């Protein structure tokens with residue numbers, strides 16, 4: 001009963017953690033979760049039950065927060081559009097999300113990803129595509145397109161110099177600032193276009209639904 | 224000849240390192256060691272030859288040492304039994320072990336595992352089972368049951384607050400103490416029951432015997 | 447056009463990064479690069495385009511630099527030869543290399559590898575062979591034998607005490623110096639002999655050639 005006050009909605013940014021499918025196609029269709037997915041759902045259960053946050057956040061994520069405004073401005077000038085940070089979190093019965101930029105005029109979501117350094121930044125188009133696949137940003141965009149009724153998403157990978165306050169004793173000013181400022185700004189944005197894929201949105205639904213059932217079972221053990 | 228003063232007995236806590244079997248069933252039956260097993264046996268050889276200890280020990284293992292008495296008391300009250308720390312190391316021709324608790328009245332070994340934090344602690348029954356499998360504690364218990372002539376083992380995963388002296392500059396008091404003290408103690412013990420499995424004990428024998436032959440070969444190279 | 451001032455030659459020490467072959471034999475023969483190889487070539491492209499050095503160097507590599515002379519002396523006394531550090535970097539159309547020791551009298555390259563500690567040092571012959579395979583030193587030697595017209599290479603893995611200036615606050619004087627000085631020096635050199643393999647040299651050619659084409663494509667995206 002207490003456990004009807006616990007209910008899982010998966011953040012769009014965490015959907016890649018639970019989206020994976022069993023290698024067995026019959027188990028995929030039966031809605032069995034992968035070991036990775038279960039491990040992620042346990043972290044979500046332990047956060048909601050105990051307040052323990054597995055991923056605190058660090059200099060990488062703090063850089064994106066500090067440069068968020070600058071990223072959105074670059075997204076805008078690259079497209080000749082006056083863009084603003086979206087400030088609403090939406091949700092449906094499965095997921096919740098707060099996108100960076102919503103452009104209703106083009107049925108378009110834009111998301112800015114502020115790379116840490118030249119090494120991690122995907123300058124090259126194959127590199128950007130893979131990074132979006134490996135990091136799960138493709139699935140994240142499908143979640144935003146679902147919540148915002150959009151037809152496309154564009155992930156703007158952007159490299160700015162690292163703000164001084166985030167460069168630790170062991171980090172390099174030369175690498176994280178000087179070398180970056182030498183590169184023309186137009187070469188430091190790489191965009192990956194993701195088309196809405198309703199079969200993928202249906203997959204998000206199936207996987208999240210299986211995750212919520214597993215989550216409920218976890219909650220019941222602690223009740 | 225000098226090398227007849229080197230002889231491998233594998234600690235119960237390290238048996239998981241050498242227990243793995245080749246994917247090839249014919250090689251398993253021929254007693255071939257896996258690459259993992261060989262790598263572990265080299266560490267054992269280099270410790271006995273050179274005094275170099277690969278695994279020093281750290282805040283995680285120090286927590287278990289500091290809270291060992293408290294763990295055993297919780298193991299006892301959970302069962303209505305007055306339990307004491309076992310203080311003998313036993314050995315046979317293959318392995319050596321010192322269990323935490325021996326209950327001859329029930330042909331039972333108990334082992335306490337003091338989790339570091341909420342994240343690493345297996346609250347959930349599937350989680351505890353997997354942790355015992357992944358960490359090799361199931362095989363460790365088979366080794367103690369062999370040495371102590373017991374029919375069952377119970378692994379008590381227990382979460383206590385982290386002692387202040389073990390919380391580094393970068394660790395969280397809030398997470399490692401405050402959040403833990405909010406959780407009822409009865410929800411911070413999860414027990415996994417392992418039945419004695421004589422086929423597994425025979426596997427320990429085979430694998431350790433192959434390890435000892437490999438070890439002897441390593442010793443001979445340095446002689 | 448600017449991009450005709452960018453040209454990839456792979457260092458012998460990095461050849462293992464790009465030498466891997468697709469699991470598909472038809473793709474291997476078509477000259478397709480593995481994902482690992484592509485990832486390495488991107489790091490090379492970003493270094494030449496932006497000056498960003500992915501691998502800076504650390505206490506492990508600094509130890510080898512400091513003890514380079516001592517290593518070469520041990521290589522020499524082990525063989526009864528007066529050896530000197532080779533000081534030329536050679537190159538051909540594919541690779542560049544600077545070997546440690548060239549012995550034209552024996553059509554022989556020697557390379558010294560200064561292990562960090564007892565744990566990482568390959569005392570055992572199987573261990574040394576695997577380390578040379580895992581680290582890619584076998585392929586590195588094929589590259590030097592190609593550049594220096596030699597028939598064989600010998601990799602001398604050598605363990606000396608770690609110089610004091612490289613032992614960090616958290617490192618052990620006892621382990622990195624005292625325990626090492628107790629071991630006879632003749633037990634702290636393990637040599638692996640690599641025969642010239644012209645089929646492997648042809649493989650280096652094919653793989654580097656595919657890498658250079660991929661590299662050129664990366665350069666063109668940034669031009």
Ligand SMILES: [Cl-]
Pocket residue numbers: 011012013096097098099
């Ligand atoms: Cl989100």
Ligand SMILES: [Cl-]
Pocket residue numbers: 060114115116117120121
């Ligand atoms: Cl990044």
Ligand SMILES: [Cl-]
Pocket residue numbers: 234235236319320321322
């Ligand atoms: Cl033990």
Ligand SMILES: [Cl-]
Pocket residue numbers: 283337338339340343344
């Ligand atoms: Cl733990």
Ligand SMILES: [Cl-]
Pocket residue numbers: 457458459542543544545
């Ligand atoms: Cl080189």
Ligand SMILES: [Cl-]
Pocket residue numbers: 506560561562563566567
């Ligand atoms: Cl090393």
Ligand code: NA
Pocket residue numbers: 100111112113
């Ligand atoms: Na973003």
Ligand code: NA
Pocket residue numbers: 323334335336
């Ligand atoms: Na224990």
Ligand code: NA
Pocket residue numbers: 546557558559
């Ligand atoms: Na060398």
